[PDB]
A paper describes a structure:
Paxlovid targets the viral protease nsp5, also known as the main protease (Mpro) or 3-chymotrypsin-like protease (3CLpro). Nsp5 cleaves the viral polyproteins at 11 sites, releasing nsp4 through nsp16. It contains a catalytic dyad Cys145-His41 that bears similarities to that of chymotrypsin. Because nsp5 is enzymatically active only as a dimer, studying the monomer-dimer equilibrium is essential for understanding the full effect of mutations and inhibitors on nsp5 activity.
GC376 changes conformation in the E166V-nsp5BA.1 and E166V-nsp5WA1 active sites. (B) In E166V-nsp5WA1 (yellow), GC376 adopts a conformation similar to IIa in E166V-nsp5BA.1 (A). However, in all E166V structures reported here, the N terminus changes orientation as Val166 cannot form a hydrogen bond with Ser1′. However, GC376 still inhibits E166V-nsp5WA1 and E166V-nsp5BA.1 with similar IC50 values as the respective WT-nsp5 proteins. NIR-resistant replicons remained susceptible to GC376, which can still covalently bind Cys145 by avoiding a steric clash with Val166 through “wiggling and jiggling. Hence, the strategic torsional flexibility of GC376 allows it to avoid steric conflict and structurally adapt in a changing pocket, enabling covalent binding, inhibition of E166V-nsp5, and evasion of resistance.
Residue numbers in the entry:
A (entry chain A), B (entry chain A): 1 to 306
Write the structure that this text describes.
């Protein structure tokens, strides 16, 4: 009963959040095994951020210039390296709360949970989606960098995101845990464009399937459509083109509810052309695109983790 | 930058979730010190739930009839009692992961985080509000009972909610940690009415203040109003009557943004009478009422916890 935008239990990630200062800049770090990961602009002064030469800036930095604090105790830095836009601080103490983890470069349209932190302490947890334009719509203030996004599979934490900056439009940009930015973004204080953000069409359809499962069915029509004719409406409304892979991913939900994918596409077509007439679906007046088909199955069947 | 419905870090609560079975019924329990708290209908069979006599049902139950599992190890039950609609199972082992905690009966309009669990294992975490009619709009399936709602103050966990049942309208009902139901609800399988749910007016105003802080200002008008004239619009649109206490709680946000409370009430009045004209505020097409004034200050200033 009910459908909510819920996030993973963040307990396994809270144990990995540390505080990292270099000079006057302080941000968060990810402590896994004997390595601490954090954005590389921790070495930047307020002036350096306009056009930083990270190679020249890092060279004037030694191990003792990095203050890594895990709660009450410090970590002795015994090595540092720069991998893309992230620093890897080698410490002498392995994190005893290190969970089973791996690094994953997420795909556009997929979702993950963000644990927003400040000064190495967690502040909150929320669910976001990697937009098609490789941005996210999160809640990040000054000091939030180094906060990580992740997914949980039973006991395996798949880290996929690390926050770095906000764009002029208010959306946020970051990297994977190997330091590669999602999108055409660079870690420099300059006006960067994210481009036209389209709607994750497969996610909208999966959300409409969750609505029928929960009792909202007023949007179910008596029409059908073709992939090509739907994508003619989709492209006009800045929606992702639907593919046969997208149809196959929506397969299990289509068989469960007995509603063909193309029939659900026709219901979504009328919604784009006629609006919503002041009505709501699952308590929303807009078409939600931050629930993937796997997020619908997980919440509607009660999948748990460690 | 950005405003999201974020939940507290659930790490301190994950360590307290256990599994409780009595007969064939299995639900979640809250393990604090040497006591396990769980809903009392764990002693009910599928037939008993229609009209249970918990006094007569509990009397035929002994300590060994309660299977309390905390992950891989069992807890030896050495005592049981019934406090209102919750059972207090005394165990021989104090939970080593017990955080600083206390029990709080939340007020209508306040918010808290829910950690949805199944079989004693966390499944997800989301933020909800205690509606004026003492219901919540959560995501709860079969097996979710015993899941708890809570707030975190630095290192103190204030447990305030325990899930018990869903209503015919799809909303959920539960108790405090002393077993007293929020609302006129009883733990029995029967059609129970929740009454007219009104909108938390002070929460809507605090959300509009968060919008101005984040850049959404199109709803700011050039009118003003009186508490009485606003409440004339409020009562018509099923909104909570605004009081001087509500104005005082919105004080710090009013002084921060330089917008008088009554002026913000006038902007909210026009929104109720004219709708939204297909526009969005903070990415929503509806007026959000699940952010309290304290939830706005916390997210817009970066308050952290342990
Ligand atoms: C790191 O904590 C911080 C996060 C920002 C601060 C406010 N909201 C956020 O998401 N990121 C930065 O300070 C970043 C540093 C660069 C070296 C990457 N700069 C940044 O986010 O500037 C915002 C901006 C840049 C250019 C045009 C408009 C805005
Ligand atoms: C406990 O896990 C369960 C939670 C329900 C199951 C589906 N969604 C939920 O929130 N609660 C119950 O099973 C509860 C047991 C009573 C003894 C309190 N009964 C219940 O929720 O029944 C739902 C209902 C009752 C009457 C009319 C319409 C629906």
């Amino acid at each position: 009963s009910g459908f909510r935008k819920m996030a993973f239990p963040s307990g396994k990630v809270e144990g990995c959040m540390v505080q990292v200062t270099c000079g006057t800049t302080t941000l968060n770090g990810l402590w896994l095994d004997d390595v601490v990961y954090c954005p590389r602009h921790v070495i930047c002064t307020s002036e350096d951020m306009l056009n930083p030469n990270y190679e020249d800036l890092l060279i004037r930095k030694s191990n003792h210039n990095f203050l890594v604090q895990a709660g009450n105790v410090q970590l002795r830095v015994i090595g540092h390296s720069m991998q893309n836009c992230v620093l890897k601080l080698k410490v002498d103490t392995a994190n005893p709360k290190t969970p089973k983890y791996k690094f994953v470069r997420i795909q556009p349209g997929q979702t993950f949970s963000v644990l927003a932190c400040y000064n190495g302490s967690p502040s909150g947890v929320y669910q976001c989606a990697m937009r098609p334009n490789f941005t996210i719509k999160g809640s990040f203030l000054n000091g939030s960098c180094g906060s990580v996004g992740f997914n949980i599979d039973y006991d395996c934490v798949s880290f996929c995101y690390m926050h770095h900056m906000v764009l002029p439009t208010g959306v946020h940009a970051g990297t994977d845990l190997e330091g590669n930015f999602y999108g055409p973004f660079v870690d420099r204080q300059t006006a960067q464009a994210a481009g036209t953000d389209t709607t994750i069409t497969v996610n909208v359809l999966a959300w409409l399937y969750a609505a029928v499962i929960n009792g909202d069915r007023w949007f179910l029509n008596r029409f059908t459509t073709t992939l090509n004719d739907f994508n003619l409406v989709a492209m006009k409304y800045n929606y992702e083109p639907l593919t046969q892979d997208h149809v196959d991913i929506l397969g299990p939900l289509s068989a469960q509810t007995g509603i063909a994918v193309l029939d659900m596409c026709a219901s979504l077509k009328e919604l784009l052309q006629n609006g919503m007439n002041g009505r709501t679906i699952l308590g929303s007046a807009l078409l939600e695109d931050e629930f993937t088909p796997f997020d619908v199955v997980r919440q509607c069947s009660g999948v748990t983790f460690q």
